[PDB]
Write a protein that binds this ligand. Structure first.
Ligand code: MG
Ligand code: MG
Ligand code: ZN
Ligand code: ZN
Lengths: 333, 333
């Protein structure tokens, strides 16, 4: 586990560019990436600022140096793919921060759980290659074969967890080293439960388990806390459609290109290419977004907001706002 | 010289190429070919639009009709082989157009030279029969014997030049008929020099001379211009790996099938059959593309971009992206 050098840390500590408020729901990561010729350092600085600003690391014995080392260890494990790169996870971290503190979801969780969520956002897609679980299973790729044999279909999610554990094995980057007993165990278990919950194949059950844990008041508080954590990481993971249109549009372009590259690799392997990943069809970007909004995002955010997270109402408003604009994109032309 | 008919020209003029931007570096010729049941006319229409859009034919006294007649006379001379057919030369023409105008290489040449380059792209592989120079020499075929006896082993290249001269000997299809004296001589000599430079046996020497000229501020201007033209036609000729992955992959498959057909004929004739031309060795495409990228394409484009053609940086970027994509294919196999 190649430890981080003081040089690597300095490159980050120098940033902290003005004109940006990382806690705002209107924060523009794309604008931030284009404000310097070292976007990876700015991205790292944003994550660093969000965590220290929450005041959480300090409270759990995690020094500023260990925090920065952890962030840099995570950064090194992300590939140069169109969407599932370091920027996506920094965005998820920033977004979760807004849900917790602008949406007041922090009231439903302990400080430790909020800390774990912000940390988990940074490890939730470690070493993603730009290919989804279905690709590994459809092509019988070695990792897919292992997943089938071992009994867990969440190919990537288990892989991300393995790497998160690897990073935390280094005392110099173990943001949970200041914890002991039940707290340290909860940090690891909750982190892992949340990453595993990002497999969209569990979307339905996760949402249902949350709504059930939220509805029934005779519900187990511990269960509600864990489910709220899982739902918040999930919400952050599919939050692209809840951002100002220009930002949402850029994220959509990025995910679409990555999907198209998977489709191209599938054509090379001679396997089935779903329309969503078929670059040939030259589909309208707007059509894919409206579809995701109608069948996935809109129902998800409306349900969790009405069931418990009232403070996140703006996500529902923005989704509807963006859907209308996507319609105009197709219309006006 | 069987003159082109009005009906033949009309079949091309009726193609409007909806949804295509022939000037874009991501233009998909395969998509254009699958857009109608008359791909040959679409291809001709693409070449026609590229030349007219350059605004060059008009400047040198070449009417729209003569230009179209020329394009059609060239088309009639290409055969139904897997790779070296009419689509390859139209692709080279389109690719060179992007190098000249998207890559700004036009700044290094006169308008006449840019005109000659676009025209030369269309004649550079005339009457190719799907067999390389080595095949003719190995088998001591009539064409190979003539090349040897006459002193020039660029078997096919000299042949393509002969057919180009034939087409231009009729005013009706002579895109250079509006030229006289020195300009006409330069047009023909430069066209011929460029075609002769496509022989890959001269790849290293051609690249070296260009780089030496580019690095020399006192290089003879005429010589530098000539070498720049030769380098640009060569660049267009080996530009497959500088295109979006799927397009690049489709070209690679055509190249392989043509090589396999030569290998089959070599076996029947009992001559040496390189592994690359052997169906039985079923070499993996990923390794084949990475090999060409590492030993030929990457260094060629990086060197010319660094030495003088800074505007073509995107070719280097795409080659890098495609290599990484083939590496992902290997990693997940
Ligand atoms: Mg994921
Ligand atoms: Mg040739
Ligand atoms: Zn994610
Ligand atoms: Zn060629």
């Amino acid at each position: 586990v190649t430890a981080i050098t003081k040089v690597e840390r300095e490159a980050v500590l120098v940033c902290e560019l003005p004109s940006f408020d990382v806690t705002d729901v209107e924060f523009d990561l794309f604008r931030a990436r284009e404000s310097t010729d070292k976007p990876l350092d700015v991205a790292a600085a944003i994550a660093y600022r969000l965590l220290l600003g929450s005041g959480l690391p300090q409270k759990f014995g995690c020094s500023d140096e260990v925090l920065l080392n952890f962030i840099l260890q995570c950064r090194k494990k992300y590939r140069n793919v169109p969407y599932h790169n370091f920027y996506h996870v920094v965005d998820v971290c920033q977004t979760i921060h807004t849900f917790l503190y602008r949406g007041n979801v922090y009231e439903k969780l302990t400080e430790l759980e909020c800390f774990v969520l912000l940390i988990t956002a940074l490890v939730h897609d470690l070493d993603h290659m730009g290919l989804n679980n279905s690709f590994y299973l459809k092509t019988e790729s070695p990792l897919g074969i292992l997943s089938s044999a071992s009994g867990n279909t969440s190919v990537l999610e288990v892989h991300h967890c393995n790497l998160a554990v690897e990073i935390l094995s280094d005392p110099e980057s173990d943001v949970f080293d200041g914890l002991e007993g039940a707290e340290r165990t909860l940090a690891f278990r909750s982190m892992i439960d949340c990453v595993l919950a990002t497999d969209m194949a569990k979307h339905g059950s996760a949402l249902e388990a949350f709504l059930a844990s939220a509805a029934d008041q005779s519900s187990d508080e511990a269960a509600f806390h864990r489910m709220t954590m899982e739902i918040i990481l999930k919400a952050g993971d599919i939050s692209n459609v809840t951002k100002p249109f220009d930002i949402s549009r850029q994220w959509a372009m990025a995910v679409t290109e990555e999907f198209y590259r998977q489709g191209d690799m599938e054509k090379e392997r001679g396997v089935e290419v779903l329309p969503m990943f078929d670059r040939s069809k030259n589909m309208e970007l707007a059509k894919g977004q409206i579809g995701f909004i109608d069948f996935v995002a809109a129902p998800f955010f409306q349900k969790i907001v009405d069931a418990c997270l009232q403070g996140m109402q703006w996500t529902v408003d923005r989704i509807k706002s963006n859907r209308a604009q996507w319609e105009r994109v197709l219309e006006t032309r």
